[PDB]
């Protein structure tokens, strides 16, 4: 969940701070870079302001990233988190040398969990695969989640087909698939509308089918 959704984002921007929010209750801030023996969480300080209150703590936690680096992160309460309104955070080092002073709009970094319960079956109806899945667990009003299905033909084959699932739909038929080939289906998810923009979730764990002869 965390490590993964951290990974998904670390996929661009070097020494950048990346806050995001999951089920739209708690924002989560983080940044990276392993160095040497003399650091730690208590080495940095994380100050925020839900626009116009006394300042607080996107309050620190160090962890080592599987890639052999270091990650610093932290969260913020729900009721306090009232979306659309900005938030500015100030992040300083040992001594109050500042390394981030950023404004972030909670509503615009919504990051979902991957969908799940993926199920592919042949079509008792032709040369199609029929795909069913379930929305990312514990996600508020599912009815405005749009998905995108991917279709690989596999490392050895090394191919593709992509499909934009209507917002709130969890089914789709996959036509135009070669006979006798092996297809790997995976689905991902983003908040459709309105307002709140964000990022694609990870691809759901995949499911493969071997297609019958032509």
């Amino acid at each position, epitope marked *: 969940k965390f490590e993964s959704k951290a990974a998904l984002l670390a996929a661009r*921007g070097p020494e*950048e701070l990346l806050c995001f929010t999951e089920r739209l209750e708690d924002l989560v801030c983080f940044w990276e870079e392993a160095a040497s023996a003399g650091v730690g969480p208590g080495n940095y300080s994380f*100050s925020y*302001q839900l626009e*116009d*209150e*006394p*300042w607080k703590l996107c309050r620190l936690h160090q962890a080592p990233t599987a890639r052999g680096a270091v990650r610093f992160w932290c969260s913020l309460p729900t009721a306090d988190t009232s979306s659309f309104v*900005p938030l*500015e955070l*100030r992040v*300083t080092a040992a001594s*109050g*040398a*500042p390394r981030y*002073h*950023r*404004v972030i*709009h909670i509503n615009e970094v919504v990051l979902l969990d991957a969908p799940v319960g993926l199920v592919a079956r042949l079509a008792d109806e032709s040369g199609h695969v029929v795909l069913r899945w379930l929305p990312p667990p514990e996600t508020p009003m599912t009815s405005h989640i749009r998905y995108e299905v991917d279709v690989s033909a596999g490392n050895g084959a090394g191919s593709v087909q992509r499909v934009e699932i209507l917002e709130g739909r969890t089914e789709c038929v996959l036509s135009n698939l070669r006979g006798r080939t092996r297809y790997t289906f995976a689905v991902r998810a983003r908040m459709a509308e309105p307002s709140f923009g964000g990022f694609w979730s990870a691809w759901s764990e995949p499911v493969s089918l071997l297609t019958p002869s032509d």
Partner: antibody
Amino acid sequence: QVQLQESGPGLVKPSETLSLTCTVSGASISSYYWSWIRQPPGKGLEWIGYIGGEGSTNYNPSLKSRVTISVDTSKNQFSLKLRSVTAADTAVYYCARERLGIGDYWGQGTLVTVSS
Amino acid sequence: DIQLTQSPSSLSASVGDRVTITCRASQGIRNDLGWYQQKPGKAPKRLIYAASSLQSGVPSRFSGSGSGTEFTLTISSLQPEDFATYYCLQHNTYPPTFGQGTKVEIKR
């Protein structure tokens, strides 16, 4: 309301100091962060440093060798202290409230010239 | 210190038409910028914050966009009072730094 005014303007003679203070009125200085800013007349602005009800500070590496920012809560004002004055200090000086990178609001503006 | 090189250096537009100002940074700061207005006798006022969010109080004829490395402030309809010198500021990598400072003049 958001208001700020700088005290005791005037003139300064080289390698001396400055006693600019900023009267804050409206919201409580307990919360936000405050900055001063410098500008040689027709040349450009330079940010100098911040300070909160935090006590904490930061100064531009171009003046950290000199600069000191002060904070009195009951007085509800904040002072700039600047020593080793020269002819590279002939500039306009503003106080502002860093809600982000400026402060929504700047202080009226004070001129202070430097010569013999 | 990071360098914010604005352009054009100054300008000359009629009442009405659509002025636009750019601001390039020696290193992408992405989101972390403010546009500012300096009137002659007046302490400077903050039009845009967080690259594109309009400050309260400033006219909606002022807007800003851009990300990372280049930035634009654009005055959708010029006013006579829109006379002033505008500056971009950066607070991505301390210290905060301003731009040269595009002055704009009213063709009349």
